[PDB]
C-alpha cells in the first residue's frame, strides 16, 4: 500500500466517491476526513496540504478535487502524475464529468483505482488497454468456443440418444 484510500472529490464538502482499501473502523476515519475536506479549513489556495504528517493530497480539477492521502515521505512527481493522470482518465472511464455518469459507472471507476494502482504502485499506461484486462479478455473466449463446442457435440449426439432411448 502506499494509500489506504483514494477518494475522488467534488467541491461539496464531500468527496464525490471513495474506496477504502482496508476496512476496520468506520467512516469516521473516512467520515472525519470527509468532514475536514468539505470544510477545507477555509484555507485559501495551494493544491497540497499535509498537515500533521498527513499528506492530503489533492488537485483541484475544477470544482473537483481528486484526493489521495499519505503520512510518511514520498517522491513527488510520480504522485503528481497521478493526480493529473486522474484528470486525464475520467471522461473515458465514467464518461466526462458530472457525478451521475460516474454514478452509473461506479463499478468501473472503483475498478479503475485497483487496476491503476495496486497499493500505491503505478501499475501501467494505456487506458484502453486497461479496459482489456477484465470484462474484456480473450483467453476465456478461445477456450469457450472450442470447449463449448466439444461438449455440444457430445450433447448433440446425446440429443439423439436421449431422443430415441
Amino acid at each position: 500500500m502506499v494509500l489506504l484510500a483514494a477518494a475522488v472529490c467534488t467541491k461539496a464538502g464531500k468527496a464525490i466517491v471513495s474506496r477504502q482499501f482496508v476496512e476496520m473502523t468506520r467512516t469516521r476515519i473516512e467520515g472525519l476526513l470527509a468532514a475536514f475536506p468539505k470544510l477545507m479549513n477555509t484555507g485559501k489556495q495551494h493544491t497540497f496540504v499535509e498537515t500533521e504528517s498527513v499528506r492530503y493530497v489533492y488537485q483541484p480539477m475544477e470544482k473537483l478535487y481528486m484526493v489521495l492521502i499519505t503520512t510518511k515521505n514520498s517522491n513527488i512527481l510520480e504522485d503528481l502524475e497521478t493526480l493529473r493522470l486522474f484528470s486525464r482518465v475520467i471522461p473515458e472511464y465514467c464518461r466526462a464529468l458530472e457525478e451521475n455518469e460516474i454514478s452509473e459507472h461506479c463499478f468501473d471507476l472503483i475498478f479503475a483505482f485497483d487496476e491503476i494502482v495496486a497499493l500505491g504502485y503505478r501499475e501501467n499506461v494505456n487506458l484502453a488497454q486497461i479496459r482489456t484486462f477484465t470484462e474484456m479478455d480473450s483467453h476465456e473466449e478461445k477456450v469457450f468456443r472450442a470447449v463449448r463446442e466439444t461438449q455440444e457435440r457430445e450433447a448433440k449426439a446425446e440429443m439423439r440418444r436421449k431422443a430415441k432411448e
Binding site: 517522491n75 504502485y121 484486462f133 470484462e135
Partner: protein, 290 residues
C-alpha cells in the same frame, strides 16, 4: 402484506442481467446504508451458480467482499464452500484474466474453508505464464501472511527460490516487498548477489531495499563492506526519485563532514533544478531538522 424485494425479483427476470444490474445498484445503495433484509440471497443463490454475467459477478462478488461474510448466518451464509467450487474452477479457470481478476478479488478475499484447496488451486495458477496472475498471488499471499500465514508455512523460501525462477521486474518488485516482510535474510542473500547488477536496473524494486536496511542497524550493525561496495555505486544516483532518496538514505546512514557535504550538494543542485515549491519546502524541513 407484500414487499418491493419481490419487485426487484421480477425486474431481474424481466431484464436479465440488465435489470439485475439495476438491482445491484439499488442493493448497493441499500447495502451502502448497511440495510437490507434477507431473502434475495436465495435468488442469488439459485440463479448464480448456473449463471455467467461476469460483470455482475464482479459486482456481486465485490459486494460480498465489502459486505460482511462472517454474517450472522455463520460465519458464512453457509454455502461459502459449495458455490466456491464453480468459482474455484474459475479460479482454476484456464482463463487467466478471469483467474487474475478473481485473484485480485481474492487478495481482498479471505474465506478459509474455501481457501484450503484453493491453496492448491492457487499454486497451480502461479505457474500460469501471466505475470498479472502471478503478481496477484503476491498480494494474496501478503493477505495470507497476516491472516493465516501458516496456512501456508513453507513460503518465505519458496518465494525466494521462486525469485530465482523469475525475471519480470514488476513481479520482482513485489516480490521484494513481500519478501523482506517475511524475512529480510533471503533478500539479503540475494542482495549480495545483486550488488553489481543493480545499477543496470529499474528503480522501484531498488527503493524497497532502502527502507529495510535502515531498521536493522539501530538494533545492531557490523555489516558494512559488502554494502559499501555497492553503495558507492549508488553514488551515481540519478532519477529524481533516486536522488531524492539517495541523499536522504545517506544521511540516515551517516553524518560525517564528508557525508554532510555529499548530501548537501545533492540538495542544492536539486533545489536549483527544482520547481515544485512544495517540494522545496519539504527538504528544508528536513534541513531544519538537520
Amino acid at each position: 402484506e407484500p414487499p418491493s424485494e419481490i419487485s426487484l425479483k421480477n425486474d431481474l427476470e424481466k431484464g436479465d442481467v440488465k435489470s439485475k444490474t439495476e438491482a445491484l445498484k439499488k442493493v448497493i445503495i441499500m447495502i451502502l446504508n448497511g440495510e437490507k433484509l434477507p431473502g434475495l440471497l436465495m435468488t442469488i443463490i439459485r440463479f448464480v451458480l448456473p449463471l455467467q454475467d461476469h460483470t455482475i459477478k464482479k459486482l456481486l462478488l465485490v459486494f460480498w467482499e465489502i459486505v460482511p461474510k462472517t454474517t450472522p448466518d455463520g460465519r458464512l451464509l453457509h454455502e461459502m464452500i459449495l458455490v466456491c467450487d464453480a468459482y474455484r474452477k474459475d479460479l482454476q479457470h484456464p482463463n487467466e484474466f478471469i483467474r487474475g481478476s478473481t485473484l485480485r478479488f481474492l487478495c481482498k478475499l479471505k474465506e478459509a474453508e474455501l481457501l484450503e484447496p484453493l491453496m492448491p488451486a492457487i499454486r497451480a495458477c502461479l505457474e500460469h505464464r501471466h505475470s498479472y496472475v502471478r503478481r496477484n498471488a503476491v498480494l494474496a499471499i501478503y493477505t495470507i501472511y497476516r491472516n493465516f500465514e501458516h496456512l501456508i508455512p513453507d513460503a518465505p523460501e519458496l518465494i525466494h527460490d521462486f525469485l530465482v525462477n523469475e525475471k519480470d521486474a514488476s513481479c520482482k518488485r513485489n516480490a521484494f516487498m513481500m519478501l523482506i516482510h517475511a524475512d529480510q535474510d533471503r533478500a539479503l542473500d540475494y542482495l549480495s548477489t545483486c550488488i553489481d547488477q543493480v545499477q543496470t536496473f529499474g528503480d522501484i524494486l531498488q527503493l524497497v531495499i532502502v527502507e529495510l536496511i535502515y531498521k536493522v542497524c539501530h538494533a545492531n550493525p557490523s555489516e558494512r563492506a559488502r554494502f559499501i561496495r555497492c553503495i558507492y555505486n549508488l553514488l551515481q544516483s540519478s532519477s529524481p526519485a533516486v536522488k531524492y532518496e539517495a541523499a536522504g538514505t545517506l544521511v540516515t546512514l551517516s553524518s560525517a563532514p564528508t557525508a554532510i557535504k555529499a548530501a548537501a550538494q545533492c540538495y542544492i543542485d536539486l533545489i536549483i533544478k527544482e520547481s515544485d515549491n512544495n517540494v522545496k519546502l519539504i527538504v528544508l524541513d528536513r534541513l531544519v531538522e538537520l
